[PDB]
Structures are given as C-alpha cells and as structure tokens.
Amino acid sequence: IKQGIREVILCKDQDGKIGLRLKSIDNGIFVQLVQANSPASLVGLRFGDQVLQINGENCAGWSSDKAHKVLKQAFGEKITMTIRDRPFERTITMHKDSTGHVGFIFKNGKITSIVKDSSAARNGLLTEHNICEINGQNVIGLKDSQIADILSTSGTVVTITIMPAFIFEHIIKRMAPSIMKSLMDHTIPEV
C-alpha cells in the first residue's frame, strides 16, 4: 500500500468504457469494481482505491451516480484521475509452515479465526477482515475453494491485502456476487 497520492491517465476504449465502477464512502469516492482487460486495469487502478480528483475536479461529497455521470461526460481522449492507494486496506506478509499453512480460517472471503503459533498470529493478522488481494492478485468474488487454491499455489512467502469487513461490506453491496466472481479483475498484473 503506497503512501500518498498518484496521478493516472486513462483513455476510453473503442466502446467508450474505462472499466470502472465507483462508490460513495464517507464523502469520498472509492473503486467498487475494476473490469479485466479494461483501461482502468491497464493503468493500475485497484479495488478500494480512492479517487480524489477527476480531470482536476474534487470528488469530495459526490454521489456514485454523479461520479459515473462525470466520467460518461468526459472527453474520452485523456482522463486524469488523482488516486490515493487503497486507504482502507493493509498488507500483511506471512510465511507458510511445513504443512504449507499460514494459520487462519476464512469464510466467504472473511477471516474468522487465527491459529495459535502460526505465521498469521506472529504477524498480527486480524479476524473480521475481508481478503482483497493475495500477492497483489484481486480475489474478490472468488469462491473460498479458489482462494484456498491460490494460497496453495503461492510459494513460501504470502502477502495478503485485507480490509475491515464493515468497510468491505459497505463498498461492495449494490453489485451481485456473480459479477464480482466473473467481471471483477482477477488477473496477475502485467508488465
């Protein structure tokens, strides 16, 4: 999670899309969904990112509908957004034990229990936090089985990005579980 603010430049694609949906949270605007293969994904926008400005205009106070409208109304040529990196989220680095475990139980993507003497415990992993990313890969909307498998296919060192569940639940709702599992970007980032 990169401290402070950065600028991204987008181009609407052929279809006039950017592949973003935005959400009003605590009088800011936050990314609720990034579409795979979209201009938004390509420029590095991530779920939970705060949009401070669009085209130099402050997003403070905007409803979701107003932010979408501003984007729909922008010249698709060059859209500048000012971004604060995943501010509701934190990253935790763990190492697997000999059995290949980091030491937590989760359910519907939410960590529910931490295992004694585990890496999860040594690194102060918390319950009541939704798993957002594993090693930089968005896993939101995947089944617990898929998330479990992604954990398995990672190496020793596992980095998880988490978000407090009450905040997570506020950001996501008004979007159907099957959209998240299908259409929320789950790619490993390209270089």
Swiss-Prot record:
Start and end of every PDZ domain?
Answer: 7-86, 91-166
Record keywords: Acetylation, Cell junction, Cell membrane, Cytoplasm, Cytoskeleton, Endoplasmic reticulum, Lipid-binding, Membrane, Nucleus, Phosphoprotein, Repeat, Secreted
Q: Which GO terms describe its cellular component?
A: adherens junction; azurophil granule lumen; blood microparticle; cytoplasm; cytoskeleton; cytosol; endoplasmic reticulum membrane; extracellular exosome
Which parts of the sequence bind a 1,2-diacyl-sn-glycero-3-phospho-(1D-myo-inositol-4,5-bisphosphate)?
108, 143-144
Gene Ontology biological process: actin cytoskeleton organization; chemical synaptic transmission; intracellular signal transduction; negative regulation of receptor internalization; negative regulation of transcription by RNA polymerase II; positive regulation of cell growth; positive regulation of cell migration; positive regulation of cell population proliferation
Q: What exactly does this protein do?
A: Multifunctional adapter protein involved in diverse array of functions including trafficking of transmembrane proteins, neuro and immunomodulation, exosome biogenesis, and tumorigenesis. Positively regulates TGFB1-mediated SMAD2/3 activation and TGFB1-induced epithelial-to-mesenchymal transition (EMT) and cell migration in various cell types. May increase TGFB1 signaling by enhancing cell-surface expression of TGFR1 by preventing the interaction between TGFR1 and CAV1 and subsequent CAV1-dependent internalization and degradation of TGFR1.
Could you describe the subunit structure of this protein?
Monomer and homodimer. Interacts with SDC1, SDC2, SDC3, SDC4, NRXN2, EPHA7, EPHB1, NF2 isoform 1, TGFA and IL5RA. Interacts with NFASC and PTPRJ. Interacts with SDCBP2. Interacts with PDCD6IP. Forms a complex with PDCD6IP and SDC2. Interacts (via C-terminus) with TGFBR1. Binds to FZD7; this interaction is increased by inositol trisphosphate (IP3). Interacts with SMO.
Q: What is this protein called?
A: Syntenin-1
